[PDB]
Design an enzyme around this catalytic site. Sequence first.
Site, PDB file in Angstrom:
ATOM      1  N   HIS A  19       0.849  -1.226   0.000  1.00 21.29           N
ATOM      2  CA  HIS A  19       0.000   0.000   0.000  1.00 21.29           C
ATOM      3  C   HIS A  19       0.874   1.261   0.000  1.00 21.29           C
ATOM      4  CE1 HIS A  19      -3.210  -2.893   1.091  1.00 21.29           C
ATOM      5  NE2 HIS A  19      -3.934  -2.085   0.330  1.00 21.29           N
ATOM      6  N   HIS A  60       1.802   1.643  -5.705  1.00 17.97           N
ATOM      7  CA  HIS A  60       0.377   1.235  -5.794  1.00 17.97           C
ATOM      8  C   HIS A  60      -0.481   2.440  -6.210  1.00 17.97           C
ATOM      9  CE1 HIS A  60      -3.477  -0.553  -4.844  1.00 17.97           C
ATOM     10  NE2 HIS A  60      -3.710   0.491  -4.049  1.00 17.97           N
ATOM     11  N   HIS A 105      -5.878   7.550  -2.979  1.00 17.76           N
ATOM     12  CA  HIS A 105      -6.920   6.656  -2.420  1.00 17.76           C
ATOM     13  C   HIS A 105      -6.371   5.895  -1.208  1.00 17.76           C
ATOM     14  CE1 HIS A 105      -5.035   3.283  -4.522  1.00 17.76           C
ATOM     15  NE2 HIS A 105      -5.779   2.511  -3.746  1.00 17.76           N
ATOM     16  N   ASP A 106      -5.064   5.707  -1.075  1.00 17.08           N
ATOM     17  CA  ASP A 106      -4.506   4.909   0.055  1.00 17.08           C
ATOM     18  C   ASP A 106      -3.502   5.758   0.864  1.00 17.08           C
ATOM     19  OD1 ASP A 106      -5.726   2.249   0.253  1.00 17.08           O
ATOM     20  OD2 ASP A 106      -4.601   1.626  -1.489  1.00 17.08           O
ATOM     21  N   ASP A 127      -8.372  -0.429  -8.298  1.00 22.03           N
ATOM     22  CA  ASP A 127      -7.726  -0.817  -7.032  1.00 22.03           C
ATOM     23  C   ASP A 127      -7.228  -2.254  -7.109  1.00 22.03           C
ATOM     24  OD1 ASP A 127      -6.648  -0.270  -4.657  1.00 22.03           O
ATOM     25  OD2 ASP A 127      -8.417  -0.735  -3.487  1.00 22.03           O
ATOM     26  N   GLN A 180      -6.340 -17.669  -3.890  1.00 22.92           N
ATOM     27  CA  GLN A 180      -6.365 -16.804  -5.101  1.00 22.92           C
ATOM     28  C   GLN A 180      -7.579 -17.190  -5.958  1.00 22.92           C
ATOM     29  OE1 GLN A 180      -4.271 -13.950  -6.338  1.00 22.92           O
ATOM     30  NE2 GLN A 180      -4.275 -14.014  -4.107  1.00 22.92           N
TER      31      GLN A 180
HETATM   32  C1  LIG Z   1      -5.416  -8.017  -6.104  1.00 22.83           C
HETATM   33  O1  LIG Z   1      -5.794  -7.776  -4.756  1.00 22.83           O
HETATM   34  C2  LIG Z   1      -5.813  -8.864  -3.897  1.00 22.83           C
HETATM   35  C3  LIG Z   1      -5.085 -10.066  -4.165  1.00 22.83           C
HETATM   36  C4  LIG Z   1      -4.258 -10.230  -5.411  1.00 22.83           C
HETATM   37  N1  LIG Z   1      -5.135 -11.098  -3.302  1.00 22.83           N
HETATM   38  C5  LIG Z   1      -5.894 -11.003  -2.182  1.00 22.83           C
HETATM   39  C6  LIG Z   1      -5.892 -12.196  -1.270  1.00 22.83           C
HETATM   40  S1  LIG Z   1      -7.302 -13.283  -1.616  1.00 22.83           S
HETATM   41  C7  LIG Z   1      -7.078 -14.631  -0.609  1.00 22.83           C
HETATM   42  N2  LIG Z   1      -8.108 -15.284   0.120  1.00 22.83           N
HETATM   43  C8  LIG Z   1      -7.425 -16.317   0.825  1.00 22.83           C
HETATM   44  C9  LIG Z   1      -7.863 -17.307   1.717  1.00 22.83           C
HETATM   45  C10 LIG Z   1      -6.823 -18.113   2.168  1.00 22.83           C
HETATM   46  C11 LIG Z   1      -5.430 -18.002   1.824  1.00 22.83           C
HETATM   47  C12 LIG Z   1      -4.978 -17.050   0.965  1.00 22.83           C
HETATM   48  C13 LIG Z   1      -6.006 -16.225   0.473  1.00 22.83           C
HETATM   49  N3  LIG Z   1      -5.839 -15.170  -0.403  1.00 22.83           N
HETATM   50  O2  LIG Z   1      -4.653 -18.986   2.482  1.00 22.83           O
HETATM   51  C14 LIG Z   1      -5.618 -19.888   3.051  1.00 22.83           C
HETATM   52  O3  LIG Z   1      -6.907 -19.196   3.046  1.00 22.83           O
HETATM   53  C15 LIG Z   1      -6.635  -9.845  -1.864  1.00 22.83           C
HETATM   54  C16 LIG Z   1      -7.450  -9.755  -0.641  1.00 22.83           C
HETATM   55  C17 LIG Z   1      -6.578  -8.745  -2.736  1.00 22.83           C
HETATM   56  C18 LIG Z   1      -7.355  -7.501  -2.469  1.00 22.83           C
HETATM   57 MG   LIG Z   2      -7.314   1.222   0.374  1.00 22.18          MG
HETATM   58 ZN   LIG Z   3      -5.576   0.634  -2.944  1.00 24.58          ZN
END
Ligand SMILES: COc1c(C)nc(CSc2nc3cc4c(cc3[nH]2)OCO4)c(C)c1C
Ligand SMILES: [Mg+2]
Ligand SMILES: [Zn+2]
Length: 313
Positions: free
Chosen positions: A68, A72, A106-107, A217, A269
């Site tokens: 962040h 970004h 925004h951040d 975002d 993911q």
């Molecule tokens: C692009 O933005 C993002 C990206 C690439 N990735 C993420 C993570 S999404 C996500 N949800 C999960 C649940 C899980 C885990 C890894 C995880 N990653 O390990 C076991 O349980 C977010 C939250 C955002 C906002």
């Molecule tokens: Mg934010």
């Molecule tokens: Zn952001």
Amino acid sequence: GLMQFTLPVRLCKEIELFHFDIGPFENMWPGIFVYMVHRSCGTSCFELEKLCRFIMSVKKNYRRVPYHNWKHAVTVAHCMYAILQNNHTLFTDLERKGLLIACLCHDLDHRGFSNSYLQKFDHPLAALYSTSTMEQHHFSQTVSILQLEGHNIFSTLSSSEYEQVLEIIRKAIIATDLALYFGNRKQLEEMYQTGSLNLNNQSHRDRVIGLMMTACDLCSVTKLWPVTKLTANDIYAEFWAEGDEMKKLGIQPIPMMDRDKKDEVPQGQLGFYNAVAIPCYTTLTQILPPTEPLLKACRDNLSQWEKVIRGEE
Ligand SMILES: COc1c(C)nc(CSc2nc3cc4c(cc3[nH]2)OCO4)c(C)c1C
Ligand SMILES: [Mg+2]
Ligand SMILES: [Zn+2]
């Protein structure tokens, strides 16, 4: 006034594409942003003296966190630029001005911790702002920076236009709270499908701008696989730091933030692409057809994560 920014040939070409990466040369990011303002908005939109001073005060108020951060900020602004450029006629002069500045800001002053962590920590910001904690902080910081002497890039707007653009930047920054995204997209989905969607209705525009903000975002998932994959390291480095801090408060964090459950990242993911990313860029592509290339790149990256799980990488 007759002073343009110009980029090298490869950047001049690739900057126009949704999947552009702004590169590892921090010192080029400000000029890249001014370039985008000039082509999207005009060389007249902003006094270059005041834009450059605003851009540098914004940079200074982003912190040295893995994700962040100032990179970004510029990245999210580039995605907004690509949307605005492929949708020339759909947006007012005030919207184009506001949204690039919204994305850059925004951040602001992100500490690398979610709203959830501020609440359980009982951080003072959680007392000042009960919902969308960080996002109300990011807008607070934007207003403060606009009020420093010499930094009011909007000073040549009428009183009404100045109030309009701050209202655009406020709704835009609040909308980056991913908690509010699910609701916003369901409503936009219903409105499009029952044909009631109307870009002359201000509350409808607000919802559409909100989804553009979520789309910009999340744009890490719309890059070429190697940028997407290497950005994920920075994303999880913040998450696992937060998870560590949850444990220090005596709270087992959600697995997403538990560095002991790295093995489940590929499956996480998949959930995230299916639950958030694909729905986001699908409803966006329905409302704004020329943003299809973001939906295509997102689906390619979903396929790359499926291959990771199947052991093929
Ligand atoms: C692009 O933005 C993002 C990206 C690439 N990735 C993420 C993570 S999404 C996500 N949800 C999960 C649940 C899980 C885990 C890894 C995880 N990653 O390990 C076991 O349980 C977010 C939250 C955002 C906002
Ligand atoms: Mg934010
Ligand atoms: Zn952001």
